[PDB]
């Protein structure tokens, strides 16, 4: 694996230098062992030393054998020890350089981190995901760039899984390697020792060259054995060894110069610190990490092998890349088969789908042409890719605290759709300035707490142009409603304020609007009904509940209005009903629930078209004979009021489909109510009935679904209601 | 591998010569170590002339050991300097030349370029796309595309390099320098190789004799080796000099594909001017075929074809036909919503009068439209606009209607004025005052032929290009924003105006420049800020109004000037909260269609019984009590839409008409329904939405009969 981490001036030159150094050691060694003769010969003209101060010949008269002895003595007991062991010296130095350059290689405490690093290196130029990743007023409303750049391509569960595995591995391997700096320390130590040995070697070997000589004056003490005292002696190899020493010294200098470069490099710039600054300078990916340890160091070393590596690695190790990967992987798995698992519907169905557990917006959801409603919950980076064009209808979109980043170029589609839009928000500005750009939005639901200032800025710029707004629901404190509401208010059909922090005067709004065909004040801290509410001639519905409203005495002037048709007064403190309610007959709904009503005058009977009445959780203990006049009564609750046994007027009606009786006193339901034949359900609970009537057989719609009873015995009818079930 | 980037008359020869030269160093080295003896011997003749010539023996009483000393001395400080180190001179230079040859390989900043270069060439060489490109099974697209992306990134990277070229030149130059020097030294120092030499070293104090004659035993082998060596080197040098000639008389820093371009299918190839060019020349030397395969692969024209084929192989004629539908004014509506371009197969659909394109980049519609017969209508929305096909005649014979939608300003093409046969145009988009004025002039000014024009936009002011073109205007519509109601000099210019529509515009009051337009014959005012009908008094004096829609407004009051009109075929009083209807509508006995809904009427007047031709009557969500008997005093009442009112039961008599085709009964709280209603021949569960069977006699009979 060394090849892919091969260092330009650390491994390349060192290996060739080392080979040459070894070669010269071997050459010299071979010669030193067998070609070194050291030819000595005696001399007669000895004056002081050197046998000088001087044809037939000399005739020294010595034995050929004894000359070899002299040679051996002069060789052993004289100078030039450097020359004698020069190739061994070279071999040692060569081996030192070779060994010191390769401690990390094949040594487990360092090779482990290199193996993890190299494994990554071999994946950066593989796993095609990498090369896909390498392919690269406003008012936060423009993102067509990313729409076309992604090319809506896929990974086919191959690049997806490969890249995912590599993300797990790059994060884990980095966490492992990043713990320390052993790889770093070894290279700094190695670089320094190479320089140290270099300096010492040159000093040592350039000095001992004066030792290599043509000849030597041999003055060893052997004349008592061999006759002559002084010998002159030649060393033929000495010429060659001066040459070899010179070549070795030059070779070491070259090595040294390169080693100084590498030591120079590792000191001039920090190597542990490392980041892909060059990538964020050139590439679209600014998401560049920086760590200071062995991982970064090893990346830095290979940065000088090939910049291409850095480009591949840098784009891979990114959260931008991972997020694009995840969205693509989402599409790979979250297909039509998975979307179908959640295609539910609740009421006014419109074929819903709610995506809650997704980390982003799938593209496959827009293949669900049949749906009209899409609910997005807690999903970040919602752009709504402009591939919603294959949908036909889109009647409702829920931005349930997701993201304000809706910038895809598909307003034309949305402007032909989205009758309704729901925005849930906990922050102030995650509400996009996108809403007003929609023109066909009729219904808008805004839920979250904004200050008066925030209401004014968000509503004026984000909503004011919704000329077709007909329905507006504000689940906000609304200490003041911005003038936008009153202006849309003249075309607005429904306005609903539903919050505990509601404390304000709405008289101006009511007067300006003068329409409000549906009005809701829920949990608003109200005690007083604003009197201008009676200018809403087309009010047609009013829901006053969960208020501090303790009176109905104020509803005197309701006849100023026409077609009221509905009055909801539940969960309030109206413990008493006056005789103004009897003048309200153009009413088709009335609800008095948990208001602690002690008494109701016979006034409800005047509203002979009431048909629907809720009398519950009131300390009333009474039923008037209004019930005998309202012969179109279809639904009535008489519960939690401790009423005595029901009076016979109970059944003097025609339908009373919903007969809800409970938490009262009823030893027995008047059996005659069973002859209405239109009972669909009878609730008989908490009343201590002794027995059940056996006249219910007359009614075909009291099969065992509507028999909400405690006893379910004392009868002959159980098999009839069971078979009908 | 490296083989394919080796130079034909350079590298194979360099390697063989280097091997032989090293062989000479090895032979000579071994020879020099064990065979060089220098047998020297003294002489007694005149030493002034190296022992000249002016049987038993000479004896020369010296010992054998002493002679070894003489030989050693003569060898060490006399002649044969060159011969003594000849094989080392050979080894050193041979290694230098060899190292120089391989210098560019395994070099820190050349290997990466070379490895990628070779891999790309091999992939291009063997890719089936290259073959097809010479003129995909849905996989060659991906493979070729991946190679194209890699090639573009590789080329971009190599584009900035000048390393491979320069290092090669430095290498060539140093080989030439060393070549000249090695010849100068090797050739010159040959006079020192002699068999017979004269040794006159000063060793008399040790040997008696000063002059020795001496025989170098390997003089001949070193002369032979040197001569053979010199010849090897000269040959090597010829190649080195050739290299410089080739490198200097050819730019090589640039490479053109002209010799291939005029033989192959492509034309779009740039002049390469960097290390890529140099590498290209080198493969051209090895084999030009690789230059060709690469060139054929790397082409934008080829990429275009590759992608086009991918479209054609997916969006086949069956795929297109299966997805071909029709919704209104049918004409074979084919929709292409997410394509990367337009497949050619769409133009073989000769019968495809309607093509709808959206979200398709770079649409160009190559002129193959001549293949088609009918192309009566074309919808280009939110796509691209690069159709410059030289085939206006085909387009002019067709394209009676164009529906083009935009998101910006400059996206709008000008293919409108060039088609003077255009009859109907629809434009939606982002407008401003000046932006619209400039574009509408360039777009519509010359279309005298235009009859129908509809604009969906934030216009804010009516342009005069439209009023001038508008003198031939049949139908005019504008919506989604209020404009200055420039009517005083617009309706008068247009003057034909046989169908006018105003939707979601800031109209509170009706303009009165329409009052004299007797040729109006159709008018639709809806979702406006209009809250009245006071203006419509003299308006209706015009004959042939035939249609008046005032729905979706705030008109809660109907006057009795409505009786001024006798010619109306459509009347819509929808969602205006009206509280009463006068018996002044019947005046238009040709009305036939009357929408009374989402009002606050609560009752109906005796007007229905005066319209014997009333066919379609909608009475819904008006809280109306039991309908008056005039309800069924008619002849047709095909559609009786009742709902969200108050009706205990239908009068049995309405079912005796028998021309009822549908009765809607939803939300009216009916207690029961009479049997006569089931006698009507066309109420056999034909759209008879009811809540319950309502105690009728023949609901299962009519269900089976249908």
Curated annotation (Swiss-Prot), chain A:
Residues 34-84, 210-239 are extracellular. The modification Phosphoserine is found at residue 140. One of its GO terms (cellular component) is plasma membrane. Keywords: Acetylation, Cell membrane, Chromosomal rearrangement, Differentiation, Disulfide bond, Glycoprotein, Ion channel, Ion transport, Leucine-rich repeat, Lysosome, Membrane, Phosphoprotein, Repeat, Spermatogenesis, Transmembrane, Transmembrane helix, Transport. Inhibited by (4-[(2-butyl-6,7-dichloro-2-cyclopentyl-2,3-dihydro-1-oxo-1H-inden-5-yl)oxy]butanoic acid), which plugs the channel like a cork in a bottle by binding in the extracellular selectivity filter and sterically occluding ion conduction. Lipids may block conduction in closed heterohexameric channels. The keyword Hydrolase does not apply. Glycans are attached at residue 52. The record marks 64 as: Required for anion selectivity. The volume-regulated anion channel (VRAC) channel forms a trimer of dimers, with symmetry mismatch between the pore-forming domain and the cytosolic LRR repeats, a topology similar to gap junction proteins. The di-leucine motif is required for lysosomal localization. Belongs to the LRRC8 family. Essential component of the volume-regulated anion channel (VRAC, also named VSOAC channel), an anion channel required to maintain a constant cell volume in response to extracellular or intracellular osmotic changes. The VRAC channel conducts iodide better than chloride and can also conduct organic osmolytes like taurine. Mediates efflux of amino acids, such as aspartate and glutamate, in response to osmotic stress. LRRC8A and LRRC8D are required for the uptake of the drug cisplatin. It is linked to Agammaglobulinemia 5, autosomal dominant: A primary immunodeficiency characterized by profoundly low or absent serum antibodies and low or absent circulating B-cells due to an early block of B-cell development. Affected individuals develop severe infections in the first years of life. This is Volume-regulated anion channel subunit LRRC8A.
């Amino acid at each position: 694996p060394a090849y892919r981490i091969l260092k330009p001036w650390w491994d390349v030159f060192t290996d060739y230098i080392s080979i040459v150094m070894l070669m010269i050691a071997v050459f010299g060694g071979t010669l030193q062992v067998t070609q070194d003769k050291m030819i000595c010969l005696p001399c007669k003209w000895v004056t002081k030393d050197s046998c000088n101060d001087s044809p037939t010949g000399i005739k020294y008269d010595l034995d050929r054998h004894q000359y070899n002895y002299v040679d051996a003595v002069c060789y052993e007991n004289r100078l030039h020890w450097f020359a004698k062991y020069f190739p061994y010296l070279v071999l040692l130095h060569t081996l030192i350089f070779l060994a010191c350059s390769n401690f990390w290689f094949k040594f487990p405490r360092t090779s482990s981190k290199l193996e993890h690093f190299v494994s990554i290196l071999l994946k950066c130029f593989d796993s095609p995901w990498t090369t896909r990743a390498l392919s690269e007023r406003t008012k936060s409303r423009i993102e067509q760039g990313i729409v076309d750049r992604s090319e809506t391509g896929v990974l086919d569960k191959k690049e997806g899984e490969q890249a995912k595995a590599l993300f797990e591995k790059v994060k884990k391997f980095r966490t492992h390697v990043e713990e320390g700096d052993i790889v770093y320390r070894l290279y700094m130590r190695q670089t320094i020792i190479k320089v140290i040995k270099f300096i010492l070697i040159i000093c040592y070997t350039v000095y001992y060259v004066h030792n290599i000589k043509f000849d030597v004056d041999c003055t060893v003490d052997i004349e008592s054995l061999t006759g002559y005292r002084t010998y002159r002696c030649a060393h033929p190899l000495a010429t060659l060894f001066k040459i070899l020493a010179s070549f070795y010294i030059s070779l070491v200098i070259f090595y040294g110069l390169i080693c100084m470069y590498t030591l120079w490099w590792m000191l001039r710039r920090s190597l542990k610190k490392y980041s892909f600054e060059s990538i964020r300078e050139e590439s679209s990916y600014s998401d560049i990490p920086d760590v200071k340890n062995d991982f970064a160091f090893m990346l830095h070393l290979i940065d000088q092998y090939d910049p291409l590596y850095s480009k591949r690695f840098a784009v891979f190790l990114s959260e931008v890349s991972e997020n694009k990967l995840r969205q693509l992987n989402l599409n790979n798995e979250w297909t039509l088969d998975k979307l179908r698992q959640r295609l539910t519907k609740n009421a006014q169905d419109k074929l819903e789908l709610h995506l809650f557990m997704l980390s982003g917006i799938p593209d496959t959801v827009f293949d669900l042409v049949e749906l009209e409603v899409l609910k997005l919950e807690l999903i970040p980076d919602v752009t709504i890719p402009p591939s919603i064009a294959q949908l036909t209808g889109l009647k409702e979109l829920w931005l349930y605290h997701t993201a304000a980043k809706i910038e895809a170029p598909a307003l034309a589609f949305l402007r032909e759709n989205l009758r309704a839009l729901h925005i849930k928000f906990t922050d102030i500005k995650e509400i996009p300035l996108w809403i007003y750009s929609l023109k066909t939005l009729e219904e808008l639901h805004l839920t979250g707490n904004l200050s008066a200032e925030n209401n004014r800025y968000i509503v004026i710029d984000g909503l004011r142009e919704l000329k077709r707004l007909k329905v507006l629901r504000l689940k906000s404190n609304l200490s003041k409603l911005p003038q936008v509401v009153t202006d849309v208010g003249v075309h607005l059909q429904k306005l609903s304020i539903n919050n505990e922090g509601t404390k304000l005067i709405v008289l101006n709004s009511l007067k300006k609007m003068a329409n409000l065909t549906e009005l809701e004040l829920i949990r608003c801290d109200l005690e007083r009904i604003p009197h201008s509410i009676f200018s809403l001639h087309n009010l047609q519905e009013i829901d006053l509940k969960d208020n501090n409203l303790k009176t109905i005495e104020e509803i005197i002037s309701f006849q100023h209005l026409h077609r009221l048709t509905c009055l909801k007064l539940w969960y309030n403190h109206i413990a008493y009903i006056p005789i103004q309610i009897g003048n309200l007959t153009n009413l088709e709904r009335l609800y008095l629930n948990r208001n602690k009503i002690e008494k109701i005058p016979t006034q409800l009977f005047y509203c002979r078209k009431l048909r629907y009445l809720d009398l519950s959780h009131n300390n009333l203990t009474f039923l008037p004979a209004d019930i005998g006049l309202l012969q179109n009564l279809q639904n009535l609750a008489i519960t939690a009021n401790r009423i005595e046994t029901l009076p016979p007027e109970l059944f003097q009606c025609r339908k009373l489909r919903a007969l809800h009786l409970g938490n009262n006193v009823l030893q027995s339901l008047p059996s005659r109510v069973g002859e209405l034949t239109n009972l669909t359900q009878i609730e008989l609970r908490g009343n201590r009935l002794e027995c059940l009537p056996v006249e219910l057989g007359e009614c075909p719609l009291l099969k065992r679904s509507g028999l909400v009873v405690e006893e379910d015995l004392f009868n002959t009818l159980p098999p009839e209601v069971k078979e009908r079930l």
